[PDB]
Amino acid sequence: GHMEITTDSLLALLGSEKVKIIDVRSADAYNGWRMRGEVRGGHIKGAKSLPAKWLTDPEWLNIVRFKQIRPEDAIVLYGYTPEECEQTATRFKENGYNNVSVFHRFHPDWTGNDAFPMDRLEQYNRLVPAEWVNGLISGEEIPEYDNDTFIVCHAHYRNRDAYLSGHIPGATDMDTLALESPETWNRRTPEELKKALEEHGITASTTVVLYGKFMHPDNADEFPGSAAGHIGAIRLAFIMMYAGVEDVRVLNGGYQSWTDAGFAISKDDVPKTTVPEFGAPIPSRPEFAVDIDEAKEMLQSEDSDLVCVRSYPEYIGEVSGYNYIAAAGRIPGAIFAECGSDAYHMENYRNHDHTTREYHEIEDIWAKSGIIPKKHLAFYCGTGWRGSEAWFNALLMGWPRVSVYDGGWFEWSNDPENPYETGVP
Ligand SMILES: C[N+](C)(C)[C@@H](Cc1cnc[nH]1)C(=O)O
Numbered sequence: 340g341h342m343e344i345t346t347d348s349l350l351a352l353l354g355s356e357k358v359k360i361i362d363v364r365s366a367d368a369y370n371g372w373r374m375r376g377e378v379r380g381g382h383i384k385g386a387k388s389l390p391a392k393w394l395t396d397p398e399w400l401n402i403v404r405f406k407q408i409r410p411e412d413a414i415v416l417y418g419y420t421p422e423e424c425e426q427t428a429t430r431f432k433e434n435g436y437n438n439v440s441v442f443h444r445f446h447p448d449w450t451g452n453d454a455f456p457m458d459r460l461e462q463y464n465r466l467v468p469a470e471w472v473n474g475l476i477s478g479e480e481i482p483e484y485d486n487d488t489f490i491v492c493h494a495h496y497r498n499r500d501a502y503l504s505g506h507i508p509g510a511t512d513m514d515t516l517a518l519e520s521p522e523t524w525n526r527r528t529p530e531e532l533k534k535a536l537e538e539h540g541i542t543a544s545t546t547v548v549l550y551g552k553f554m555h556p557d558n559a560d561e562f563p564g565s566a567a568g569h570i571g572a573i574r575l576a577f578i579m580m581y582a583g584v585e586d587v588r589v590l591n592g593g594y595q596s597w598t599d600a601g602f603a604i605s606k607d608d609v610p611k612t613t614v615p616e617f618g619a620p621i622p623s624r625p626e627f628a629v630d631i632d633e634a635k636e637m638l639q640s641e642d643s644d645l646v647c648v649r650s651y652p653e654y655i656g657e658v659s660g661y662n663y664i665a666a667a668g669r670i671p672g673a674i675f676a677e678c679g680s681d682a683y684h685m686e687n688y689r690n691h692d693h694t695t696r697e698y699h700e701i702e703d704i705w706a707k708s709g710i711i712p713k714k715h716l717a718f719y720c721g722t723g724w725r726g727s728e729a730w731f732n733a734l735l736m737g738w739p740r741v742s743v744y745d746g747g748w749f750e751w752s753n754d755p756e757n758p759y760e761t762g763v764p
């Protein structure tokens with residue numbers, strides 16, 4: 340019943356402003372993961388991501404409208420299989436979208452023929468799906484993995500209960516306080532990171548798969564970070580990558596993506612299998628970390644900028660954003676990139692299933708504010724968690740000079756002589 344567009348008609352529609360090509364597959368296949376063993380992973384050039392699993396969520400229509408997909412547009416759906424687009428095509432028709440067509444020949448006609456344009460996340464192999472993690476712990480052959488030593492880490496902030504309430508089988512928990520000091524809220528000393536990483540069984544040659552569990556943080560609680568598990572996992576990914584771990588993966592979406600895939604969980608308290616040595620100088624990637632002295636230089640140079648990954652009430656100085664940060668204000672000269680509702684949510688960088696937002700939508704918003712890969716960018720926030728997530732998103736894009744200003748507003752405001760702004764800009 341649904342209309343069909345031929346491959347030649349779709350090739351002619353490429354570049355039109357009225358046409359919207361929508362990838363129905365998962366975000367990981369959209370990012371570049373070859374989920375069905377295709378010769379070439381990714382999406383049709385110019386396509387948007389709207390996974391079919393979002394149909395069971397009542398915000399589907401709001402997600403579509405938020406992506407500015409209007410009924411005036413010619414909708415072209417595709418996936419690994421045209422029958423996988425039948426449910427989405429019907430839902431579009433039931434909501435006032437009359438021009439809905441299904442592209443039947445994406446796999447293997449578009450994937451196998453390199454003459455057809457395809458785009459992908461340049462560093463997608465660091466944003467692993469749940470199926471990849473399951474194959475890793477099962478000893479099965481998986482793509483984008485050529486190592487022999489791995490470890491799955493469940494990140495949390497003074498909350499082992501986040502690990503004991505349910506985790507990936509065989510995984511071990513790492514409190515974020517093991518890699519960052521509560522005094523400076525920055526990354527720890529190399530000697531401290533060396534001891535901490537070794538005691539958790541992590542070497543530089545180890546493939547560390549990091550993930551966290553979202554447990555709905557509340558700003559009024561004592562330690563809301565204990566529920567922002569996935570932000571801490573990306574925060575720990577930044578520190579480990581800065582330390583010298585070469586193969587660091589992050590589970591796209593966190594713990595929920597594991598359970599949403601139908602994989603069982605474990606509640607065991609897995610003991611740590613320590614390693615005698617880390618095996619590399621810490622830090623082996625010093626470029627990833629930027630401190631306050633270098634941050635002030637980047638504010639003065641047109642070659643560099645700092646990206647304020649904070650919430651709007653924090654940016655205008657209405658609130659500090661934390662129950663342990665006294666001063667309220669913003670660093671002058673930094674480019675504002677709103678993170679989300681408060682300091683413990685990343686709505687502007689995530690989907691409703693906590694997977695990373697469509698990376699094309701992120702770089703377009705960043706481009707409108709001057710945040711471009713041409714510059715050396717040091718993302719920051721209150722202490723570094725939200726800045727690390729935005730930094731990881733840019734690193735997945737392949738940006739050559741992205742860093743994290745570790746000190747953030749906390750270190751900046753701890754000095755009374757540092758300038759600061761307030762109110763609406
Ligand atoms: C540095 N701690 C762990 C105390 C932060 C972490 C954090 C979460 N969202 C932004 N930052 C906090 O919990 O407020």
Ligand SMILES: [Cl-]
Pocket residue numbers: 352353354355358360384385386
């Ligand atoms: Cl297009």
Ligand SMILES: [Cl-]
Pocket residue numbers: 551552553566567568569570571
């Ligand atoms: Cl989270």
Ligand SMILES: [Cl-]
Pocket residue numbers: 647649668669670673748
């Ligand atoms: Cl700021």
Ligand code: NA
Pocket residue numbers: 523524525526722723744745746747
């Ligand atoms: Na920090």
